[PDB]
Amino acid sequence: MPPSEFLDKLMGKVSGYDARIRPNFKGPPVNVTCNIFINSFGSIAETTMDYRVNIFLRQQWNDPRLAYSEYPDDSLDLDPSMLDSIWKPDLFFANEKGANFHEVTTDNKLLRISKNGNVLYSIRITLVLACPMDLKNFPMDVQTCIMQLESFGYTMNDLIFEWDEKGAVQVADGLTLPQFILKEEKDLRYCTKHYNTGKFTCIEARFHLERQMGYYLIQMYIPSLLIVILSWVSFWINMDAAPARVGLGITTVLTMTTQSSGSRASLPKVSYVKAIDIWMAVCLLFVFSALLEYAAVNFIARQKLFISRAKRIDTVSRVAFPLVFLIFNIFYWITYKIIRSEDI
Amino acid sequence: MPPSEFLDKLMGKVSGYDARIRPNFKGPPVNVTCNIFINSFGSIAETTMDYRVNIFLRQQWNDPRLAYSEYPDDSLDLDPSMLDSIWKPDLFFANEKGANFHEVTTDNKLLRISKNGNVLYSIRITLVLACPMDLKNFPMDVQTCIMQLESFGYTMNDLIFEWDEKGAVQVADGLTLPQFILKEEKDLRYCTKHYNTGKFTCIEARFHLERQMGYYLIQMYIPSLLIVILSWVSFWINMDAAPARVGLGITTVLTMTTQSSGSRASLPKVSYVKAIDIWMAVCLLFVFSALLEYAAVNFIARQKLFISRAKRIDTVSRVAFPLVFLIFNIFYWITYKIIRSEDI
Amino acid sequence: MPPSEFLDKLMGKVSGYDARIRPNFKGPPVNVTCNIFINSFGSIAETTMDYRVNIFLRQQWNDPRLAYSEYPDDSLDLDPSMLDSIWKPDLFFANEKGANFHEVTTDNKLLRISKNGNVLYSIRITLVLACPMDLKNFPMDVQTCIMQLESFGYTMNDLIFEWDEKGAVQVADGLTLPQFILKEEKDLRYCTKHYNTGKFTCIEARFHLERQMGYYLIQMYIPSLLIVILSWVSFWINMDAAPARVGLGITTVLTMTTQSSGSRASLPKVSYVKAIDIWMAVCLLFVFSALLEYAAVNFIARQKLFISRAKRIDTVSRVAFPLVFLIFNIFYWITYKIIRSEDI
Amino acid sequence: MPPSEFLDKLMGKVSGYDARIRPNFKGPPVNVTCNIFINSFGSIAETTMDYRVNIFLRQQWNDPRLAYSEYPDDSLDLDPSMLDSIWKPDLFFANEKGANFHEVTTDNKLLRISKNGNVLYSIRITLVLACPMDLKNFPMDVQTCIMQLESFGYTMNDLIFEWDEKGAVQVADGLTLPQFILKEEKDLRYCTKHYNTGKFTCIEARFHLERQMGYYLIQMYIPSLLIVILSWVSFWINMDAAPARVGLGITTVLTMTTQSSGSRASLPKVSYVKAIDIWMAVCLLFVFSALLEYAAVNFIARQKLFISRAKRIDTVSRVAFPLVFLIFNIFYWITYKIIRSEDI
Amino acid sequence: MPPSEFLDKLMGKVSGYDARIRPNFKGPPVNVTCNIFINSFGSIAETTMDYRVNIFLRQQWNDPRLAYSEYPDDSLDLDPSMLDSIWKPDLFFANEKGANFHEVTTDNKLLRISKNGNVLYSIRITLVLACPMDLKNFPMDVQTCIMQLESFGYTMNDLIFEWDEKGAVQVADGLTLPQFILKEEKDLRYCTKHYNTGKFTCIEARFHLERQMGYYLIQMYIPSLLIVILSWVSFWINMDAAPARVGLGITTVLTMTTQSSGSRASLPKVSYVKAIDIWMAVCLLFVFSALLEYAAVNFIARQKLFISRAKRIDTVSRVAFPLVFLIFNIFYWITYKIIRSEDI
Ligand SMILES: *[C@@H]1O[C@H](CO)[C@@H](O[C@@H]2O[C@H](CO)[C@@H](O)[C@H](O)[C@H]2NC(C)=O)[C@H](O)[C@H]1NC(C)=O
Ligand SMILES: *[C@@H]1O[C@H](CO)[C@@H](O[C@@H]2O[C@H](CO)[C@@H](O)[C@H](O)[C@H]2NC(C)=O)[C@H](O)[C@H]1NC(C)=O
Ligand SMILES: *[C@@H]1O[C@H](CO)[C@@H](O[C@@H]2O[C@H](CO)[C@@H](O)[C@H](O)[C@H]2NC(C)=O)[C@H](O)[C@H]1NC(C)=O
Ligand SMILES: *[C@@H]1O[C@H](CO)[C@@H](O[C@@H]2O[C@H](CO)[C@@H](O)[C@H](O)[C@H]2NC(C)=O)[C@H](O)[C@H]1NC(C)=O
Ligand SMILES: *[C@@H]1O[C@H](CO)[C@@H](O[C@@H]2O[C@H](CO)[C@@H](O)[C@H](O)[C@H]2NC(C)=O)[C@H](O)[C@H]1NC(C)=O
Ligand SMILES: CCCCCc1cc(O)c2c(c1)OC(C)(C)[C@@H]1CCC(C)=C[C@@H]21
Ligand SMILES: CCCCCc1cc(O)c2c(c1)OC(C)(C)[C@@H]1CCC(C)=C[C@@H]21
Ligand SMILES: CCCCCc1cc(O)c2c(c1)OC(C)(C)[C@@H]1CCC(C)=C[C@@H]21
Ligand SMILES: CCCCCc1cc(O)c2c(c1)OC(C)(C)[C@@H]1CCC(C)=C[C@@H]21
Ligand SMILES: CCCCCc1cc(O)c2c(c1)OC(C)(C)[C@@H]1CCC(C)=C[C@@H]21
């Protein structure tokens, strides 16, 4: 007979199936297997603190009833329009800004009922998940994107869902994300929302993102360093050349001020301090201190002992400033590597 | 018997329940308990003057009728699709740009009816609430976000709602807001909209936000200060070096003009004066005044008394300018601390 | 009897009410009283030329029929879902980019029917109204926002609507608009759209906005002025200092070019000239002319008469340039004040 | 009798009107008169290549049937909700990114049926039309916006539509567009989409836009010119002043590099060359060539014949560079005026 | 008889057509011909990694049943509203961010049934397709846009679709894309999604985009080159002019730092290195090295042999630096041309 009408027979008014009643009512909890496939991952935004994913949610659960066992066909495909008839678990996302279904040509929803009573339900969804992130160490940060599936109004005694045994989370290859790189650990855990009403089920899949330092290393870090090196040539310039040294020193100060001012527009718009800010502030200190010594030495030589003292101060700061800059660099880089390692 | 049909019996045409009639009609006012849980708080925008929240609205009210008292089950869960049947209070938000419900998989709406007649109604909502804010003192400002729930068309004699006794407003931990920090006071009050028709009920929960000065202190405030210090070295430079002093002074003026020009792009786009604007204007004054004195002293020495007078002017402005800058700094910081303390 | 069913009796098929037929058909025009309350005003955008408002539209009109006169209740509240039953005037907005209703929890629509037959209809709407604006004088401009309500397909003989006698337009206090200030005149007028088909009714409420000059005065106007003052110190610098004067003059030219280049990013993106553009162009002229004279005087003194002539040219331009700048400033400010006064 | 029911009689099941069948089936083509009124024109975006319009589409066509000829009323107004009943021509827009109807209070749709059988159908629509545009000559470009109405699935033998005889396209006064100016020619033409299936009807109204050169002339063009003039003063400066000339020349090069760098942010983000780019490149050449000659002359005089040769080179390039710049300016402006004239 | 009712006869309950059953059930696979017409291509966004297209999807398939063969008309046009009746293949797009239908006036859907049983189905769709792209070589990159059509839930034994024999993909002329140029190869291939359930059909059309180097060549590449040339004039400047050389060298360093800082705002916001970044870093090296040699030579001459050695170093670096810059340029350009050729 026509396959669709057989389904009508199964879920129709004649037979006592009420879509509003959980399978195994007043009984053992319904177990739901969950499989997630990520088509596209991207659009991470630091300001609004959300990223966008397109996924293929796949729930598997067993229904005691709705087992026909008298048909040649081994499975039945329900029409996507009349999806109200089957009881579907109310699975939502705890950290959801907004999500909607797809209607490109037909509903991207597939439901298949096996002979024994297994139900396979697949839904293609696009989601704006909200993940808290921080930029304490902005060039070298490892953010974690948390995706959590939780029930709405059903307790542990009623509905339980957990991850599939193998291949629970899969990702289509070649994401080519603009800033971060998606790692392949994809660790899975459990959450149990303990509320006043009772325990609620939750499962959680998190993803690790590691930010690439290509543009960050080549721009900002390398030019600042070079400008500090060019700041130190004033030491090697003879003391008598007052216009040449004053002009060079102030111009280098202007140069770094322009570099920082230009780079902040590219940088994220946050209010707490970051690592790049510390680096820029330290470079401003180095250029500023190098100008100050020139004005601290020229005063000394106009008022032959003073000449000797001035040249001594020149040579001392000549070998002092690179070595102190090296000590700063070693400590700064070591500290950030240790802190990122601690994070991971 | 099947739980759903029992509900049908209760709210069906057979029994006289009209969803359009308030419980306790022509009687004492219906009291509605209100609980709010904030999943996510963020996306504060100074231009459009709105912020976005995702909440879990939870209304509790007592209905005299709809009390079954003849069933084993202690509570009944109504289907979210057929929510028209129950009478729901028309609670809206007075300051709403836009809001919509969630349909991730199923309706994020739960309604539960107790044995006695208590109704528990939970709705997950995302809201764009509008809060007036001001930036009279932009780096150190404390804005208040006002969330107010008001009735639509029901008077105090008909419908009254107030906050829950304990845990009325709850916030999920780890917001990690980009600029502000959410405080934990969360004070609650009442409003009564007195109109021509009559008094209308309203309850109001406000949140205090304190802006972090990390990036604001490290960038702009610290470099400007350093550039003013480098402006004062021209005093210590000998008078005879006309190219060195003129070049240094104008270059410092250029340097601050570039810093202010770069920083305004990062700053908010408002038309009234702020605190950072006062600081930048004052620094421009300091660099400008320091150039002016050099051109006021060089004229004096070309026309031995004049030489003495010139060197006197040099030494006087040498000890004058830092001390006056210190007096300005003390007054500026003290005034802003007092005004922010007054605000809080 | 139940209040709702009484309404059913009134507007049901049994009685001859056809919602598609105007009250007083083939008769005197229906008069509609209109009241507007502005919850929020903001999001003025110069590029797309639209602003966003949230309002409380309140239409009052009298219906000859639908007068019950046999009930204890003095008014009847119709269910918002079944609003098709009553005849509602088709009032639209002539300058509408986009508008939509609110569904925060329930429909924000209230309709109340009095005993005599008065109908009170209240709708909360958010609107993107389009108002033409211009920036001929950008820092000192007074734009007018025009809100106009017009009928759609009904002539003057059929439907007429006008403003309420008192309190026709009300605004909630504390808008805190980022750039403009909303004035309180709120003048009301009439329009009659004379078309080929006939006269159509329209009423119009306009709002006056005055742009604050805080940030505009403190930034751009004040630094440019100071840079022009620093440009004139080259006159007081001795002629013999060729590196000092050439360096100072070109550096000041660079300084203003940087200020204008930075400020244009903040400024609106329009193609016609404004006032700030005239001010920046004039300042560029002043710096350019001051460099030109230095190169016009140095040539004169290398080829003792020439020395005297050169020093004469120096002193003449020394007292010339400030006074001419003052004459420009007086004319520019006076002209803009007169033109803005003419506008208002 | 009630006017609405008369319409029911006309289009009801009793009478044989099938809304799915074209008027004059198996007969002469239906002729549709088309009238367009533009409420608002704006939001031209060069990146996405689309502009937004709000229009009043007005189709007039004659229906042989649906002529009552037995009623006092001379016209009948159909309810906007039940618009499925009448047969409406399937007119779409060939170059449409997105469009939607308006629901401000009621449907902005009016349909009126005359006594003889003329049908007047008016729809208010907002449209995002896509028009290809180019910026070969960006400051002086004349873009054309093409609006084309075409049938969907109906051939010339079935459905033909053309423009109204007089006042086919009308525009509400005072657009105040930010960059372009809308011209009043508004020329109308025909298109016939010849496909594999057959000829399809189309009518096309295009609009001419002329870009204002106010801000473009005052900023960028005028300062660059002035900086080139200030570059040439180095020629008049004496050869012996090596710091003054080298400093001035390089500073002018820096000045133009800053102006171009600042202005590109304001300019459109396209990849092909424009006119402003040619102007900036040419100015960079002029400043660069003027620095090169100074370094080409100073070498000559250190190695009395060489002194004479150097001063000769100075005077020659002194009168050479302005005149060559003038020749460039004349050719550049003449070429752009000719090309824009060719376009129009 | 009326054409529509004949269709009703064909697909009505009386005849056994169940829209939920595939044509040729339990039989040979249904073959679907696919034709795509691109109205508009644009809005390529590097950040979110998606582009927007407006297309005319045209599916052709043969249905054994639904062949009337007793009517004068050679084809039947089904009403777009009642499209549920016919069985439509569930064709979706594998890489879809979001897509929706058009409702400008009527549904942009046409279905025509031939006499034999061929079904022609045309749908106008706007799509946000997601294509991975990379910017390893940003000025000279060739990205590929992949459009793939795949079935949802139907295996190869059930449903197969492939491209039309001729004119499978067509593009309307005159795209005028802002950055890329669309090529005309438009190569077609197959994909077969091998899953756990079975093989699924897919067809794939890709488009080649070549980025124009107009603005990229004229701006950034040409000025940097010129600034490096102006950096080398310091070699030709005499050694004794310490203020002139130091001032020129540092000013050129400042000039390039400003150019790079300004240009990054225009450039895409990605984290990995690009080609333009390498070019800017190399130019910073050239200016930095040229300053370093001046400070490496001046030290040598203050401590007649040293004078000779200094002048030797000057001449050596004078002929060294251009030639090394030439070697770099040749290698850089050759490498990028080879890599782009490899890509294509
Ligand atoms: C879902 O899985 C849970 C896992 O705990 C099952 O619960 C256990 O079932 C076994 C088998 O009957 C019992 O031995 C345990 O006592 C159960 N534990 C609890 C805590 O109930 C549950 O049976 C599964 N659901 C179904 C429908 O089989
Ligand atoms: C809702 O709470 C209000 C609080 O005022 C209750 O009103 C009071 O009820 C008590 C108990 O009967 C009376 O003694 C007071 O006279 C009431 N005050 C007023 C102003 O009416 C009200 O009864 C509560 N609602 C319900 C349904 O119990
Ligand atoms: C709506 O107001 C108009 C105002 O013009 C009323 O029209 C006038 O009504 C008075 C009172 O009967 C007459 O004396 C005038 O001749 C009317 N003027 C016109 C131009 O018709 C109108 O009656 C009001 N509508 C209703 C329903 O009362
Ligand atoms: C629509 O206009 C067309 C214009 O071509 C009309 O077609 C012509 O009608 C006249 C009058 O009967 C004939 O003399 C011509 O032979 C027709 N030309 C063609 C090409 O058919 C058409 O009749 C008009 N439609 C209606 C319904 O009158
Ligand atoms: C769709 O095309 C496929 C192409 O493979 C057809 O399948 C072949 O049909 C021919 C003709 O009967 C047979 O000789 C082959 O054995 C078939 N191959 C396979 C793999 O089945 C198929 O018949 C076409 N569909 C229809 C409805 O004709
Ligand atoms: C090595 C034995 C005596 C050293 C005296 C000495 C000299 C000196 O010039 C400085 C010293 C210490 O400390 C540091 C921290 C390096 C300073 C950096 C800031 C500036 C302005 C000066 C530096
Ligand atoms: C202390 C006894 C006499 C002081 C004379 C004196 C000298 C002086 O140079 C100034 C004085 C006062 O006032 C202040 C406000 C500090 C001025 C700041 C602005 C400039 C251009 C000059 C400053
Ligand atoms: C007062 C009696 C004779 C005055 C001669 C005189 C001298 C002079 O230097 C100028 C004069 C007029 O006109 C103005 C408009 C002020 C000019 C501004 C532009 C420049 C380059 C030069 C200015
Ligand atoms: C007029 C008789 C001989 C002229 C010799 C001559 C000299 C000269 O300096 C130049 C000449 C031609 O050609 C132009 C194109 C103007 C050049 C512009 C670029 C630079 C660096 C030099 C210019
Ligand atoms: C040709 C025979 C001996 C050459 C000695 C020599 C001299 C010299 O100045 C340089 C040399 C090599 O290597 C290159 C890579 C060109 C250097 C570029 C970086 C700087 C600071 C110096 C350059």
Residue numbers in the entry:
A (entry chain E), B (entry chain A), C (entry chain B), D (entry chain C), E (entry chain D): 32 to 334, 401 to 441
Which of the paper's sentences describe this entry?
Glycinergic neurotransmission across motor and sensory neurons in the brainstem and spinal cord is mediated by glycine receptors (GlyR) where, in addition to pain perception, they play a key role in respiration, motor coordination, and muscle tone. GlyRs share a conserved architecture as other members of pLGIC, with each subunit consisting of an extracellular domain (ECD)- a twisted β-sheet of ten strands, a transmembrane domain (TMD)- a four α-helical bundle, and an intracellular domain (ICD)- a primarily unstructured region between the third and fourth TM helices. Binding of glycine in the ECD triggers a conformational change across the three domains, leading to channel opening and then eventually desensitization, involving distinct gates within the TMD.
The analysis of the GlyR-THC structure revealed an overall conformation similar to the previously solved GlyR-Apo structure with an RMSD (pentamer) of 0.45 Å. Notably, the capping loop in the ECD (Loop C) adopts an outward conformation with no ligand density in the neurotransmitter binding pocket. The TM helices are oriented as in the GlyR-Apo structure with the M2 helices revealing multiple narrow constrictions along the ion permeation pathway at the Thr13′ (Thr289), Leu9′ (Leu285), and Pro-2′ (Pro274) positions. The pore dimensions at these positions are below the Born radius for the solvated chloride ion (2.26 Å)43 and are therefore likely barriers to ion permeation. The Leu9′ sidechains in both the structures are oriented towards the pore axis and form a hydrophobic girdle, which performs the role of the activation gate of the channel. As expected, and also as previously seen in the GlyR-Apo state, no ion permeation events were observed for GlyR-THC, even at this elevated potential and concentration, confirming that the GlyR-THC structure corresponds to a non-conductive, resting state-like conformation. THC does not evoke GlyR currents on its own up to micromolar concentrations, and the maximal potentiation is observed around 32 μM37.
